[PDB]
Amino acid sequence: PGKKFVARVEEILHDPPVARVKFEDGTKRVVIIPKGIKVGDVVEVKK
Amino acid sequence: PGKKFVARVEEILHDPPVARVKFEDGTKRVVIIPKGIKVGDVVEVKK
């Protein structure tokens, strides 16, 4: 299935979308999110 | 969907953008990234 991780969306980089998200421990990852996500959202993400 | 891969951005080559990224295992790939990415970021990339 995957592991349990929560991150917060800071900046969305849409350019015809990806998101820079901060995890629980200050880590920053830029992940692929579907169109509909906004900044400030909390998302569940794995490895 | 795609597989799970993490890479680190080393150099951005913007010239009117692409990025040289190192994966988990020292591999280097130059991928297409949207405008907003910076060097040192960790990005999720597939095949």
Numbering used by the authors:
A (entry chain A), B (entry chain A): 4 to 19, 24 to 54
Article sentences:
To examine what determines the DZBB–OB transition, additional intermediates have been engineered by sequential mutagenesis and experimental validation steps (design-12–17). The 2nd generation mutants, design-13 (tkoL2_v1.2) and design-16 (mkaL2_v1.2), have ~60% sequence identities with design-2 (DZBB-fold), and retained moderate thermostability. In these designs, only a short segment was from rL2 (segment 1: from the middle of β1 to the start of β3), and the other parts are from design-2. Helix α1 (segment 2) was also omitted. The crystallographic analysis revealed that design-13 still adopts the four-stranded OB fold, indicating that segment 1, but not segment 2, could serve as the determinant for the fold transition between the DZBB and OB structures. Only high concentrations of design-13 and -16 retarded the migration of dsDNA slightly. The acquisition of the weak DNA binding affinity of these two proteins may have resulted from additional lysine residues at the end of β3 and the 3rd loop, compared to other OB-fold chimeras.
Here, we study fold transition between distinct β-barrels by protein engineering and structural biology technique. Here, we discover that the previously reconstructed ancient DPBB sequence could also adopt a β-barrel fold named Double-Zeta β-barrel (DZBB), as a metamorphic protein. The DZBB fold is not found in any modern protein, although its structure shares similarities with RIFT and OB. Furthermore, the reconstructed OB fold could also be converted to the four-stranded SH3 fold by a simple circular permutation. Thus, these ancient β-barrel folds (DPBB, RIFT, OB, and SH3) could be readily interconverted by a few feasible mutations through the missing-link fold, DZBB, indicating their significantly close evolutionary relationships.
